[PDB]
Amino acid sequence: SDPLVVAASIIGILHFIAWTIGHLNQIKRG
Amino acid sequence: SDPLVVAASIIGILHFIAWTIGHLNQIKRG
Amino acid sequence: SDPLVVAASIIGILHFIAWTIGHLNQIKRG
Amino acid sequence: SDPLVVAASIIGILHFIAWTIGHLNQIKRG
Numbered sequence: 016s017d018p019l020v021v022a023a024s025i026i027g028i029l030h031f032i033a034w035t036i037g038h039l040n041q042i043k044r045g
Numbered sequence: 046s047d048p049l050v051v052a053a054s055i056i057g058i059l060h061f062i063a064w065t066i067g068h069l070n071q072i073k074r075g
Numbered sequence: 076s077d078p079l080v081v082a083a084s085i086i087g088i089l090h091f092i093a094w095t096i097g098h099l100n101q102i103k104r105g
Numbered sequence: 106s107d108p109l110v111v112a113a114s115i116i117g118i119l120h121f122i123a124w125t126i127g128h129l130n131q132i133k134r135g
């Protein structure tokens with residue numbers, strides 16, 4: 016079922032959760 | 046089929062805009 | 076012509092070139 | 106003939122590994 020489309024996407028969402036922790040640079044470092 | 050293709054890309058604009066605020070750190074440099 | 080599939084990846088490569096700037100994150104330490 | 110869909114998923118694996126590199130920046134700080 017066109018698993019090719021879901022595979023990339025799946026990683027796409029995986030990056031967001033990682034983003035929040037990375038944002039801490041901004042918050043802290045004004 | 047459920048819009049799998051657009052569903053993933055939808056988030057993409059989010060990651061793009063969030064990117065800019067990141068660079069904001071290098072400014073002060075320190 | 077399923078422009079959705081081709082147009083969405085475009086951003087994908089755009090992030091890689093910007094990525095290298097991040098190296099500056101630790102370049103200044105120790 | 107241009108597997109765009111699979112083309113993205115192939116790149117991401119590259120991002121995931123470099124991604125952790127940032128974590129040095131924050132952890133040390135907090």
Ligand SMILES: C[C@@H](N)[C@]12C[C@H]3C[C@H](C[C@H](C3)C1)C2
Pocket residue numbers: 020021023024027049050053054055057079080083084087109110111113114
């Ligand atoms: C880069 C990402 N938004 C995707 C990855 C794959 C190719 C394009 C459509 C869809 C699946 C999402 C672009």
